[PDB]
Design a protein around this ligand. Structure first.
Ligand SMILES: [Mg+2]
Ligand SMILES: [Mg+2]
Ligand SMILES: [Mg+2]
Ligand SMILES: [Mg+2]
Ligand SMILES: [Mg+2]
Ligand SMILES: [Mg+2]
Ligand SMILES: [Mg+2]
Ligand SMILES: [Mg+2]
Ligand SMILES: [Mg+2]
Ligand SMILES: [Mg+2]
Ligand SMILES: [Mg+2]
Ligand SMILES: [Mg+2]
Ligand SMILES: [Mg+2]
Ligand SMILES: [Mg+2]
Ligand SMILES: [Mg+2]
Ligand SMILES: [Mg+2]
Ligand SMILES: [Mg+2]
Ligand SMILES: [Mg+2]
Ligand SMILES: [Mg+2]
Ligand SMILES: [Mg+2]
Ligand SMILES: [Mg+2]
Ligand SMILES: [Mg+2]
Ligand SMILES: [Mg+2]
Ligand SMILES: [Mg+2]
Ligand SMILES: [Mg+2]
Ligand SMILES: [Mg+2]
Ligand SMILES: [Mg+2]
Ligand SMILES: [Zn+2]
Ligand SMILES: [Zn+2]
Ligand SMILES: [Zn+2]
Ligand SMILES: [Zn+2]
Ligand SMILES: [Zn+2]
Ligand SMILES: [Zn+2]
Ligand SMILES: [Zn+2]
Ligand SMILES: [Zn+2]
Ligand SMILES: [Zn+2]
Ligand SMILES: [Zn+2]
Ligand SMILES: [Zn+2]
Ligand SMILES: [Zn+2]
Ligand SMILES: [Zn+2]
Ligand SMILES: [Zn+2]
Ligand SMILES: [Zn+2]
Ligand SMILES: [Zn+2]
Ligand SMILES: [Zn+2]
Lengths: 73, 222, 92, 362, 100
RNA sequence: ACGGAAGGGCACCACCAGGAGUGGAGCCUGCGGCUUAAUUUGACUCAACACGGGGAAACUCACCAGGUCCAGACACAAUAAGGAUUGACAGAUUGAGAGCUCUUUCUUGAUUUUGUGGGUGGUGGUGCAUGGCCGUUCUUAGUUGGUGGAGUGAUUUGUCUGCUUAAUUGCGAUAACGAACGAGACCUUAACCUACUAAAUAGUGGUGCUAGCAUUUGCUGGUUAUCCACUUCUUAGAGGGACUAUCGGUUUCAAGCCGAUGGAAGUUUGAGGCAAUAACAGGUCUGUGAUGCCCUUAGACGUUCUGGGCCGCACGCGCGCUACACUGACGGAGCCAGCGAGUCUAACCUUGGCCGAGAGGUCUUGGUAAUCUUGUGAAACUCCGUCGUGCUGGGGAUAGAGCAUUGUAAUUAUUGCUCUUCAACGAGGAAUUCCUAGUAAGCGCAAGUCAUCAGCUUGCGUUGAUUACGUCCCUGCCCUUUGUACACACC
């Protein structure tokens, strides 16, 4: 036990904290009309009517489904 | 479906683990030992202690929680394990009880000589043939040493050691370190009632009844 | 220690009905006996209850015996929302 | 844990601090302590000592809910885990021709288990999907109505519902009704000639082995009479026995019933296995002596590969009473010993006239 | 009826008194019996180094546990069979009864 | 306490008379050194060095290069459901389908997160702060009160001149008397019992049934449901038996010792287990959820994952294993133990059949065991051959090629098998170890470790000598006297 030089680089790189946004749950806004649901839900009803299906690029993604519901709309 | 060798070793280790558990939790109840009796449909665990009211609790609540504890750990079915408490006799003739009482006196803050002479006087008053208590460790100084306190006579070698000497060892956790308590009690062989009533080298010659010399031949008839 | 509320509740109700709980000192076991929650979860939940005087712990050959106290049974009563002296693990 | 608060003697209940002194009830207001173990509370008034056992009866119900039980709160909880009215559930079983025969029970009636016994009528007889086999009885749930949902149909086409299929295997003719292909008993099995003809080019565009289309493999045969082009891939045609399909290179004709493929069959002794083709008529024989006890038990059977020996081995394995050992009928007939006993009688000056028998001479 | 009683303790005197009162109960009931067959005593040995660490003279130490096994064959009806298996309970003596 | 002081008595960890050796060779293994990213570490005369049960591929594991995670209780304060926080597909990144981190957004919802206090863990330090255990002084006979006696006192006597014993074991003597511990007794084991109780999990005889060879009748076998009888052999329980018995020598003629006879047994019958007082600054914090203090505690010295290392080779030491050949190697035959261990929610010990040169494979089987493996059909040994004084058919190190098994993984070869390669070594210098009868030595076997791996250990039996029956010369030990300027005590 002499010391630790840390030849591995400066990598105290601890991650986000589920990045704190503003208000969420953007369904849509309608003047004196009904609002529909953007980010259409997963076809699995285990992830039903409450989950926002992600839309990154070239795929869609689920958290309530789990990690996997890959379709190209 | 187990061999006899493994079964007997297994219930030996079960006895050892149960005794360790009971001496870990019932130290302040004067826990003096345990006995196990297997029976068709039921196995019974006899705790031999001094403060049976503290072992039991209100309506045996501590007994119920101890049965549930040993049940949950050793995977027994409901009703198959039962615990009883029993007030041990001759508390002075119990090295484990005396060692635990000395440990608690030293923890409370009694002087070492006062505690050791109290335990040796109690054991000698209880009818023992001899008592010997050893306290080892850092006593009033950083350099450790050992103190011995004896009364009566104790033997050290041979089969009578297994027959008559009961010994116990305890670790006392003082703020400067650990003291070691060793208690040896040689009981009176005469009060044994189970096994030899005397030491092997003790020889008793019975007294001959003396009869007066007759010096005259006579015949009794019917 | 972070665990779900439902299996925290499962540990607590098992403790309330039985009155005792024995947990082998084997982290990563991922399935306690008698409780369908992880062994690490039951061990750390009972350690947290031990710290606030609600349950006592004995170690004894790698098995963590836990018995809850009177303050513990009152705390778990009002935690799990049972009426006063409904059914503790103290049946005669 | 803690010192009593100064100046606070209490009523026996504790409900009231500073109890009014009562000679009649010392240290007591005298009103019920009502500490509630039973929800109602202690029946007795505040007292020195614990509360007595509850006096209020509560009512719980039997497993089916038809009857209740008024039991004292002090005991009821335990009695609760045991109450059962035992009146039969009687609920219609799923088949609807049965009612649950179970007594009052927690949970559902469960599957109908009423044995179904065919009555003594041809229509009444329970039968197979093929209808080849008629069975006297079966469990009601165990009956499996055909997935096809069609009753067994024979050449007549009369349909009698079949609730199981017989294992037997039957050959089915092509539409040409010249050549035929082996198949299994099936739900509503097709009449001979119903099946499309593989040999006919229009009816089948694939090989007999299937696997690949016939046209791709080879030019299609001009006529049904012309044999379908055989191909290297195995035909896989079902054998008459049905133990295996077929590893032979594809052939237009049906697989021959005798099999080049030999199936290992164990001898009666079982110590040896002789591989014989399927369809072999006989039980394998190994040159070793039976070496088993006769009915008398004083002799050993010397017959080679004896029919009696497998039964004898099983008989020995089964636990046998002293009486059972003595009984000749349990011992197989071939093993029974017909030799004269030739043993001294009780007098010892005479020889037993009886044939050899187990046990002491008369 | 063919029952066999197997006793497999480590305590010789308790084993022998259990065997003795079983056989005297059997002869009191006038039951034909094969006497107590005493199997070879099996000695379970464990040899260890005495030291907890590893220095000093290499002193070794053998511990042994002795298992004593007996069995008695009995031909008795079923009521005396249950009374036999209900009587003769001894601490430290492992008893098992088998039929046929 | 010591003495190159005296007297007496002892010990194969002393010698004598010898045996087997070791020291020399190759290899195995541990230690130092060197080397290294690391080659983790403790221990260094007996009383460190095949020791830490330490036979490390991962794990173990403590070391090195790197990556995670928190398993940071509890309390207080802050953030905070207009959300505290948790997780993640794909790609980038990474040895790595570790979102570890980043891009992109979904998901979770009071458990957490941040700060202060306070914990927890640590094979981190300290064995010179400790407990417990062990080793050693020290395998020898030694140690201590009470009351009397001596001395101003430390202290002494008791606890001793002789003789005796393995023994402060005894006979005795006697300012001591009576006791206690140790020794002995004891307990376990090995030897005897044709005496008791028994046994289809041990055997034997006879009768059934049956095979072969013979011929009145015999001999050798097979088969337990074929039954009967017995307990010599075998296994236990309970007992018996040895006490140095008897006789003869010798001794104040006591304790004892020597010889012969009888006896299963006559060195306390053999071998152990247990084993005092006082101590060591012996070893161990790396056995322990045994521990005080110190250190560390979230890019942790916690823990886990990946890969290395503990094995690295100029050298020097300590345990050992194979040998240098004919008192042998090889090949066929012959053909005999004892101690043991073994599978349940698992996969252990494995018979038998088949395949394969082998190692091994495969299909079954018995066994939770006095039943089955297993008569553990072991090896040395015997008997017939082959070789033939040639480093040779001695020896089998070091290499090459291939086939298998264990295991996630075998590369620095895990082991096993086959063919080929065929090195030192020609009996070992100074030194130095162990040992007195079923012992030394030879020879293998089981168990521990153990998935695999013995050249190690703990036991067991098989074959079985030579030479003492002493002494105090060397090395030590006990007791007494004596000298001392020593007292951490002759280092
Ligand atoms: Mg000598
Ligand atoms: Mg020497
Ligand atoms: Mg010499
Ligand atoms: Mg040699
Ligand atoms: Mg020495
Ligand atoms: Mg490693
Ligand atoms: Mg590692
Ligand atoms: Mg660590
Ligand atoms: Mg030390
Ligand atoms: Mg120490
Ligand atoms: Mg004096
Ligand atoms: Mg004076
Ligand atoms: Mg004196
Ligand atoms: Mg015969
Ligand atoms: Mg004489
Ligand atoms: Mg001796
Ligand atoms: Mg330690
Ligand atoms: Mg090493
Ligand atoms: Mg050594
Ligand atoms: Mg050779
Ligand atoms: Mg040979
Ligand atoms: Mg044998
Ligand atoms: Mg290895
Ligand atoms: Mg081995
Ligand atoms: Mg080793
Ligand atoms: Mg001088
Ligand atoms: Mg000085
Ligand atoms: Zn989805
Ligand atoms: Zn009142
Ligand atoms: Zn009530
Ligand atoms: Zn009341
Ligand atoms: Zn009902
Ligand atoms: Zn029905
Ligand atoms: Zn029903
Ligand atoms: Zn059919
Ligand atoms: Zn056709
Ligand atoms: Zn085809
Ligand atoms: Zn075919
Ligand atoms: Zn066929
Ligand atoms: Zn037959
Ligand atoms: Zn017959
Ligand atoms: Zn046959
Ligand atoms: Zn007649
Ligand atoms: Zn007859």
């Amino acid at each position: 036990r002499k010391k630790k030089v840390y030849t591995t680089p400066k990598k105290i790189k601890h991650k986000h904290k589920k990045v704190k946004l503003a208000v969420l749950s953007y369904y849509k806004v309608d003047a004196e009309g009904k609002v529909t649901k953007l980010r259409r839900e997963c076809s699995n009803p285990t992830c039903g009517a409450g989950v926002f299906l992600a839309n990154h690029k070239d795929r869609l993604y689920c958290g309530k489904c789990h990690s996997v519901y890959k379709v190209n709309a | 479906l187990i061999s006899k060798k493994r079964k007997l070793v297994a219930d030996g280790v079960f006895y050892a683990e149960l005794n360790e558990f009971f001496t870990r939790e019932l130290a302040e109840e004067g826990y003096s030992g345990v006995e196990v009796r297997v029976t068709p449909t039921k196995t019974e665990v006899i705790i031999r202690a001094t403060r049976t009211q503290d072992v039991l609790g209100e309506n045996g609540r501590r007994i119920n929680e101890l049965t549930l504890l040993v049940q949950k750990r050793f995977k027994y079915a409901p009703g198959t394990i039962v615990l009883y408490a029993e007030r041990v006799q001759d508390r002075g003739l119990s090295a484990v009880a005396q060692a635990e009482s000395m440990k608690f006196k030293l923890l409370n803050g009694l002087a070492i000589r006062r505690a050791a002479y109290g335990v040796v006087r109690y054991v000698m008053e209880s009818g023992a043939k001899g008592c010997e208590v050893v306290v080892s460790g850092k006593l009033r100084a950083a350099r450790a040493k050992a103190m011995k306190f004896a009364d009566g006579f104790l033997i050290h070698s041979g089969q009578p050691v297994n027959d008559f000497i009961d010994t116990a060892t305890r670790h006392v956790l003082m703020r400067q370190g650990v003291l070691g308590i060793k208690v040896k009690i040689m009981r009176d062989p005469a009060k044994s009632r189970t096994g030899p009533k005397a030491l092997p080298d003790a020889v008793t010659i019975i007294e001959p009844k003396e009869e007066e010399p007759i010096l005259a031949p006579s015949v009794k008839d019917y | 220690m972070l665990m779900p509320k439902e299996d925290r509740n499962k540990i607590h109700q098992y403790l309330f009905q039985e009155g005792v709980v024995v947990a082998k000192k084997d982290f990563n076991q991922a399935k306690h006996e008698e409780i369908d929650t992880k062994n690490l979860y039951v061990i750390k939940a009972l350690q947290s209850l031990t710290s606030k005087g609600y349950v006592k712990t004995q170690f004894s050959w790698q098995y963590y015996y836990y018995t809850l106290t009177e303050e513990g049974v009152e705390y778990l009563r009002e935690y799990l929302n049972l009426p006063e002296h409904i059914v503790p693990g103290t049946y005669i | 844990k803690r010192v009593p608060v100064k100046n606070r003697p209490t009523c026996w209940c504790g409900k009231v601090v500073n109890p009014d002194p009562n000679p009649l009830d010392p240290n007591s207001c005298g009103q019920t302590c009502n500490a509630s173990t039973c929800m109602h509370g202690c029946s007795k008034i505040c007292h020195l000592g614990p509360h007595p056992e509850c006096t209020r009866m509560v009512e719980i119900m039997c497993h089916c809910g038809k009857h209740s039980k008024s039991i004292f709160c002090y005991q009821s909880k335990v009695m609760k885990k045991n109450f059962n009215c035992q009146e039969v559930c009687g609920l219609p079983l799923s088949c609807s021709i049965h009612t649950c025969k179970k007594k009052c029970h927690p949970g559902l009636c469960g599957p109908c288990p009423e044995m179904i016994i065919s009555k003594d009528s041809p229509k009444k007889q329970i039968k197979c999907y093929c209808g080849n086999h008629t069975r006297a009885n079966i469990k009601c749930s165990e009956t499996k109505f055909p997935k096809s949902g069609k009753s067994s149909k024979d050449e007549n086409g009369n349909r009698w519902i079949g609730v199981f299929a017989c294992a037997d295997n039957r050959v089915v003719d092509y539409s040409c009704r010249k050549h035929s292909f082996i198949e299994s008993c099936i739900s509503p099995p097709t009449i001979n000639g119903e099946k499309a003809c593989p040999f006919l080019p229009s009816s089948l565009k694939t090989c007999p082995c299937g696997r690949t289309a016939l046209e791709e493999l080879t030019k299609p045969r001009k006529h049904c009479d012309d044999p379908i082009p055989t191909c290297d891939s195995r035909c896989g045609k079902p054998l008459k026995c049905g133990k295996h399909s077929c590893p032979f290179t594809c052939h237009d004709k049906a697989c021959m019933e005798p099999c080049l493929q030999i199936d290992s069959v164990k001898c009666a002794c079982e110590q040896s296995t002789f591989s014989v083709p399927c369809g072999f008529q006989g039980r394998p024989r190994c040159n070793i002596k039976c070496e088993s006890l006769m009915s008398c038990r004083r002799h050993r059977c010397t017959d080679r590969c004896c029919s009696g020996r497998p039964s004898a081995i099983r008989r020995k394995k089964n636990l046998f009473r002293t009486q059972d050992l003595l009984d000749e009928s349990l011992v197989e007939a071939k093993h029974i010993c017909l030799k004269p006993c030739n043993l001294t009688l009780s007098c010892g000056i005479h020889k037993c006239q009886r044939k050899c028998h187990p046990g002491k001479c008369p | 009826i063919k029952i066999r009683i197997t006793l497999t303790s480590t305590k010789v005197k308790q084993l022998e008194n259990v065997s003795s009162n079983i056989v005297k109960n059997a002869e009191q009931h006038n039951l034909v019996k094969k006497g107590p067959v005493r199997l070879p005593t099996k000695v379970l040995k464990i040899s260890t180094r005495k030291t907890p660490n590893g220095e000093g003279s290499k002193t070794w130490e053998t511990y042994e546990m002795r298992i004593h096994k007996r069995y008695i064959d009995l031909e008795a009806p079923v009521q005396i069979v249950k009374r036999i298996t209900q009587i003769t309970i001894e601490p430290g003596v492992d008893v098992e009864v088998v039929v046929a």
